[PDB]
């Protein structure tokens, strides 16, 4: 998870191929609510076929899953059992001699 | 060329007026219009350039304006 978050911290933005959010003319708003965004999106989708299922953003390698000490010591302290273990040393005590 | 067509006159004369039209233009004339300070200057220069007359001009989506240079994209509400 730490390696993934470091890798995600490298992949943390659209480093290449930003959105082509060019703005055309401010159309003469005699009517309507200047909702140009939907028409622009429909036009660009029709003209470019952005979903042609071939292009990719590829802002990072999708590889090079580096691993390192750097975060391993976040082991900190384990919430282990056997902090008190009298039951389990009595478990050994059953086999103190070879019996059973 | 071809030699005959299907035709009809539009009886009862009624024809719809479009709610909007979109035009796409080469950078030079586009910028030459966009830098104009007023709407009627743009309108009148477009009228001069393309011989478009208000009320009377028939248009369709994907109609050409000039090859290499400009075209009519879409129309509303009807195409």
Swiss-Prot record, chain A:
It comes from Saccharomyces cerevisiae (strain ATCC 204508 / S288c) (Baker's yeast). It is found in: Cytoplasm, Cytosol; Peroxisome membrane. Induction: By oleate. Interacts with PEX6; forming the PEX1-PEX6 AAA ATPase complex, which is composed of a heterohexamer formed by a trimer of PEX1-PEX6 dimers. The PEX1-PEX6 heterooligomers associate with the peroxisomal importomer via interaction of PEX6 with the peroxisomal membrane anchor PEX15. This is Peroxisomal ATPase PEX1. It comes from the Eukaryota. Belongs to the AAA ATPase family. The gene is PEX1. Present with 2100 molecules/cell in log phase SD medium. AAA-cassette D1 is required for interaction with PEX6. ATP-binding in AAA-cassette D2 is required for interaction with PEX6. ATP-binding and hydrolysis in AAA-cassette D2 is required for proper function in PEX5 dislocation. Component of the PEX1-PEX6 AAA ATPase complex, a protein dislocase complex that mediates the ATP-dependent extraction of the PEX5 receptor from peroxisomal membranes, an essential step for PEX5 recycling. Specifically recognizes PEX5 monoubiquitinated at 'Cys-6', and pulls it out of the peroxisome lumen through the PEX2-PEX10-PEX12 retrotranslocation channel. Extraction by the PEX1-PEX6 AAA ATPase complex is accompanied by unfolding of the TPR repeats and release of bound cargo from PEX5.
From Swiss-Prot, chain B:
Transmembrane segments: none annotated. It is found in: Cytoplasm, Cytosol; Peroxisome membrane. Present with 1630 molecules/cell in log phase SD medium. It comes from Saccharomyces cerevisiae (strain ATCC 204508 / S288c). Component of the PEX1-PEX6 AAA ATPase complex, a protein dislocase complex that mediates the ATP-dependent extraction of the PEX5 receptor from peroxisomal membranes, an essential step for PEX5 recycling. Specifically recognizes PEX5 monoubiquitinated at 'Cys-6', and pulls it out of the peroxisome lumen through the PEX2-PEX10-PEX12 retrotranslocation channel. Extraction by the PEX1-PEX6 AAA ATPase complex is accompanied by unfolding of the TPR repeats and release of bound cargo from PEX5. It comes from the Eukaryota. This is Peroxisomal ATPase PEX6. Belongs to the AAA ATPase family. The chain holds residues 81 to 159 of 1030 of the full protein. AAA-cassette D1 is required for interaction with PEX1. ATP-binding in AAA-cassette D1 is required for attachment to PEX15. ATP-binding and hydrolysis in AAA-cassette D2 is required for release from PEX15 and proper function in PEX5 dislocation. Interacts with PEX1; forming the PEX1-PEX6 AAA ATPase complex, which is composed of a heterohexamer formed by a trimer of PEX1-PEX6 dimers. Interacts with PEX15; anchors PEX1-PEX6 heterooligomers to the peroxisomal membrane and mediates their association with the peroxisomal importomer. Interacts with UBP15.
């Amino acid at each position: 998870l730490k390696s993934v978050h470091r890798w995600l911290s490298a992949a943390d933005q659209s480093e290449v191929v930003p959105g082509n959010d060019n703005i055309e003319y401010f159309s003469i708003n005699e009517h309507g609510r200047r909702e140009e965004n939907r028409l622009r999106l429909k036009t660009l989708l029709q003209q470019d076929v952005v979903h042609e299922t071939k292009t990719s953003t590829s802002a990072a390698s999708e590889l090079t899953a580096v691993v390192t000490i750097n975060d391993l010591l976040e082991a900190c302290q384990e919430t282990k059992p056997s902090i008190s273990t009298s039951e389990l040393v009595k478990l050994r005590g059953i086999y103190d001699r070879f019996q059973k | 060329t071809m030699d005959f067509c299907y035709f009809e006159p539009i009886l009862d004369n009624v024809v719809p007026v479009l709610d909007s039209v979109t035009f796409l233009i080469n950078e030079q004339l586009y910028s030459k219009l966009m830098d104009l300070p007023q709407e009627m200057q743009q309108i009148q220069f477009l009228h001069y350039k393309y011989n478009i007359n208000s009320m009377e001009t028939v248009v369709h989506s994907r109609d050409i304006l000039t090859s290499g240079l400009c075209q009519i994209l879409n129309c509303s509400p009807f195409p």
